[PDB]
Amino acid sequence: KWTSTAIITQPDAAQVATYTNALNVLYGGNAPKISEVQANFISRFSSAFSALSEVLDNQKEREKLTIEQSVKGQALPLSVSYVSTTAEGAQRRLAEYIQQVDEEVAKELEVDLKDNITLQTKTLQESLETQESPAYYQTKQTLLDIKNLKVTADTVHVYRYVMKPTLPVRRDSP
Amino acid sequence: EKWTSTAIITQPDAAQVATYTNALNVLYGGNAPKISEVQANFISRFSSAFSALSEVLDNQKEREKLTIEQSVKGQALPLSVSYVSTTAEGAQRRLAEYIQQVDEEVAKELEVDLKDNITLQTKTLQESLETQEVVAQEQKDLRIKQIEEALRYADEAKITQPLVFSPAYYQTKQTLLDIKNLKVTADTVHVYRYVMKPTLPVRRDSP
Amino acid sequence: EKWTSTAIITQPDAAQVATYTNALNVLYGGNAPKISEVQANFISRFSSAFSALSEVLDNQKEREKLTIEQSVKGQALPLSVSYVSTTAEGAQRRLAEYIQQVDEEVAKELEVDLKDNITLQTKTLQESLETQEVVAQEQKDLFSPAYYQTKQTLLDIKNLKVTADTVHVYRYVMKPTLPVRRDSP
Amino acid sequence: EKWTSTAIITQPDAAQVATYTNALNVLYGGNAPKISEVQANFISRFSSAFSALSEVLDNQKEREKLTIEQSVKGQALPLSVSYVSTTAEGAQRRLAEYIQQVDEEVAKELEVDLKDNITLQTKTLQESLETQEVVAQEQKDLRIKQIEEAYYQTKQTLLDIKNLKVTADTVHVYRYVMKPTLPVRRDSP
Amino acid sequence: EKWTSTAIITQPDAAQVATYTNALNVLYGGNAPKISEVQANFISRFSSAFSALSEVLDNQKEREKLTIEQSVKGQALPLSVSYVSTTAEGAQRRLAEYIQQVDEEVAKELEVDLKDNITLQTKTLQESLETQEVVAQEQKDLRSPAYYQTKQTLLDIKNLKVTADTVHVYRYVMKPTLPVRRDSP
Structure with missing residues (x-):
């Protein structure tokens, strides 16, 4: 029994920006x-x-995954930990x-x-059917931008490390 | 013969709140x-x-243990609820x-x-127009007799002597139609959402 | 021997606070x-x-245990209060x-x-009305729109029906409990 | 011979903060x-x-136990403070x-x-009075040279600012919820 | 044998942060x-x-103990930091x-x-003025004093002296202590 420990935090502005812009494009100042x-x-x-963690405990061969606030009482950072059989085993599994x-x-x-790119197209393809026009022509620019952005399957990160998972030097006290 | 089952639940998403969120706008908009x-x-x-059910249940004659605690001690959501019972699926069922x-x-x-809010809104909105149109009548009956005080610009005054209101009052009457025609499906309102469904305990607790 | 009764309480209903809140609009508009x-x-x-009561009850020669705490830990409301006493009924009663x-x-x-303030604004508003009344006549020799506001708000102030049956500072989520079983001795 | 006294303390009420809040408006208005x-x-x-005092006092040769903790664990206010001493009436007084x-x-x-906030606003207000004046009067001379070949309130503010001396005696930083108690029993170890 | 030094720290005051904030009040202005x-x-x-340092320091072959916890439990600031070491003064200094x-x-x-931000704002206002010099040309191509404040700031930005020794991310509330007693089993 050897426990690896990582410390994590909210994704930084950089890591969100892609997704956040998409939201501006789709919703303005809302x-x-x-x-x-x-x-x-x-x-x-x-x-x-933390669901992963209940689940991991609820099995034949149980595993201890852990999420707690690093400073008790403070929202971020979060420090996660995991127990495995060998020092490098933990450090890699975590x-x-x-x-x-x-x-x-x-x-x-x-x-x-x-989903929202197509579900809020039903307001863009639904102003063309409202006509068939002054402020109304802005909807044409917005739909052009809601087409100009592509949500790549590698843009969004929901966390950022503060400390990458550790190689435990000592084994756990039983 | 004691086994706890746990679930992790969080706030309901936007969709599960759609119904009630709409009706709240219709009845209020800005505020x-x-x-x-x-x-x-x-x-x-x-x-x-x-957390009340929890208390009830422990003060039963035939004691039950149902609990609610923050999943990450310190963070507001998610909440993880658990329940102890006779059998593994007993717990999972009951949870x-x-x-x-x-x-x-x-x-x-x-x-x-x-x-209850549908009641108190309509009460005031009807009472507003009942004060607005009791006086917007009166002040136009004053005018039809304060001008009927004939003689200061003579002949032309007899020409001085069909109500249309502000689009402020026209809006209110249009929204009070929507507010009086608001349909509440109690089967639409959902108050929490699962993060993880109640567990089927593999092991068994013991102190 | 020792029996613990337990209520669960929370902040008052929006409706239960309505009179008070209104009286503050009339007296302060946007503040x-x-x-x-x-x-x-x-x-x-x-x-x-x-909390204070609790502390005082513990500092008596004849010791009383009254407690307040967040029902869900580290979650603001609801709060659950509790009282210990010599009889299950008595515990529930005294709580x-x-x-x-x-x-x-x-x-x-x-x-x-x-x-304090119904009384206090009826002083601070003649000092803006009856002050602007005779000070108008100093422009007549050597009427305001803000003056009528002051008049109107004062009219509202005197309409205020605030009997001390207005204020309710908590609502039950669960009324005190009748404890089947006594404390683990 | 140890006796704990206990006060419960909260944020000071609006009135005890009157001056300081007004003074803060005088210099910043809506902000x-x-x-x-x-x-x-x-x-x-x-x-x-x-809580500093508290840590300091527990590091004397002559240890003193003075504490502060939220009264309702998990709730920001009120907070209850306590002090241990040798004589019951001794605690209550020292606390x-x-x-x-x-x-x-x-x-x-x-x-x-x-x-410090007076002496930093002054030098940003004056330095924006001077920069609005001597850069928009060099736009009045870029309109006269084109013809050739409530900010007064910002000064009024500044006079109220200058007439904003605030007495030390007014400021109170806490309000009691319960004044410190006289322990009736003594602590058990 | 084992001694514990303790410091209490908080968020840095305006003063200590000025240098850095000023710079942001330039390049982002009102944002x-x-x-x-x-x-x-x-x-x-x-x-x-x-708290990362703390995690590392525990993991060392000879373990080391550094601590960060909220001074008043469940209150955001201040933080109480602490360190254990062999000697009294040694635990103080090393904290x-x-x-x-x-x-x-x-x-x-x-x-x-x-x-990094300076390098973005410069290049974001270079890319704006390269299109503004496609419109300054355009001014007398068919024949504002507002966009002459944009180039006027993008010089305060070009200036900006911000040495990392003038950036302080904590303030002491209490400097690391000199432990009178040693610890205990």
Whole structure:
């Protein structure tokens, strides 16, 4: 028994920007702030990561995955940990899990947008059917931008490391 | 013969709140609470109720242990709820039931709290127009007799002697149509969302 | 021997705060707190008072255990209060009373705070009305739109019906409990 | 022979903060922090300093146990403070004296901050009065040379600013919810 | 045998943050975050690093113990930082040490970021003035004093001296202590 520990935090503005712009494009000044977006992402992460963790404990060969606030009482950072049989085993699995979550959340979040790109086209292809016009021609520019952006399956990250998972030097006290 | 089952639940997403969020705009527009806020209020209402059920259940004659705690001690969401029982699927069954129980219990309270708002809005809006059109009549009956005070510009005054109102009052009457024609499906209002469904305990607890 | 009764309480209903909140609009228009903010205020004053009582009851020669805590840990509301006593009925009884004690005690301080200002603005508004009345006539020798506002707001101020049965600083989520079983000795 | 005294303390009420809040409006108007925000900031300062005292006192040869913790664990206000001492009446007196000690200490540190914000607004207001004047009068001379070959309130503000001396005696950083108690039982170890 | 030094730290004051905020009030102008927001971000950045240091220091062959926890439990600031070491004075100095070892580490990432931002704003206003010189040409091609403030600022930006030794991400509330007693089993 050896525990690897990573420390993680909300994705930085850079890591969101792609997704956040898409939201501006689609929603103007009703689009949520950058800050809120990062906050939402790490929320989504932790929330899913703690499910992984109940699940991992609820099996024949049980595993201890862990998410807690690094400074007890402070929203960020979050420090995650994992136990495995060998020092390098932990250090590698944690990382794998952190990524496993990230990916799975991210995927779902990309789905939301690629859904909204088509679900809020039904207001853009629905102003052409309203005509067939002064402020009305701005809708033509917005639909051009809602076409100009492409949500690549590698843009969104819902977390950022503060400390990459550790190689434990000592083994766990039993 | 004690096994806990746990679930992880969070605030309801926007879609599950659509119904109630709309009706709140229709009835209020500007001062109407943001989706964010509604979402929060809902989960808050759930968690509060579930923590009461919890207390009830422990003060039963035939004691039950149902719990609610923050999944990441310190973070507001998600909440992880758990329940101990006779058998593994007993726990898993009952957890779920109890979750719907609270959900529903609260969903009803909301639906009631809404039809209560439908009442108090209409009461004032009808009473506003009943004061607006009691005097916008009167002030136009004053004019038809303050001009009928004939003699200061003589012949032309007899030509001085069909109501159209502000588009401010025209809007109010149009919204009060929507507010009086607001339909509340209690089966549409959902108060929490799953992160993880109640678990089927593989092991068994013991101290 | 020792029995613990337990209520669960929360911030007052939007409706339960309505009169008070209104009275603050009439008295302050845009510096007047949101309903939501009065709600949170009120319960905060409840729990602070309730905390104090608790501490006092423990500092008696004849020791009493009254406690307040967040029902879901590290989640603001609801709060669950509890009382220990010698009989299950007695525990339930005394709790509800203490909750009421606190409620009323806070309410009447908040009442007295508002009735300070019904009295206080009827002084600060003749000092803007009857001051602008004779000071108009100093322009007549050597009427304002803001003056009628002052007149109107004062008219509203005197309409205010605030009996100390206005203020309610908490609502139950669950009324005190009748404990089947006593404490683990 | 150990006896714990206990006060419960909260943010100071709107009135005890009157001057300082007004003074903050005088210099910033619509961008001044809310009354509420000041109140919060004040008690936050009290608290932080109180916990310093507390750590300091527990590092004497002559150890003293003075503490501060939220009264409702998990809820920001009120917070309850306690002090242990040798004689019951001795605790109650010292606790209150300490509460007063911190209060005062902090008030002074806020007095300074008022002054520092005066002397930093002044030099940004004047430097924007001068830069609006001597760069828009060089636009009046780029209209005269084109013809050839409420900011007065910002000064009024500045006079109110100049006439904003605020007494030290007004500022209180906490309000009691419960004045420190006289312990009836003694502590059991 | 084993001794514990303790410091209490907070968010940095306006003064310590001025240098950095001024620079943001230039290049982002009115989209610059509030000082409140800046101070907040700083101490956040600090503690995040402090708790990483702590994680590393425990992992060393000879384990080392560095601590960060909220001074008043469940209150945001102040933080209580602490260090254990063999000797009294040694635990004091090495705390202080590890504290500045972080303050620096952070300031340097913040210098790196401001640098990066300067390089973006310069190139974002180069790319604007290369189109504005396609419109300044256009002015007397068919035959504002507002966009002459854009080039006027993009010089304050071009200037900006911001040395990483003038960026402080924490303030002491209490300097690391000299432990009178040793610890205990």
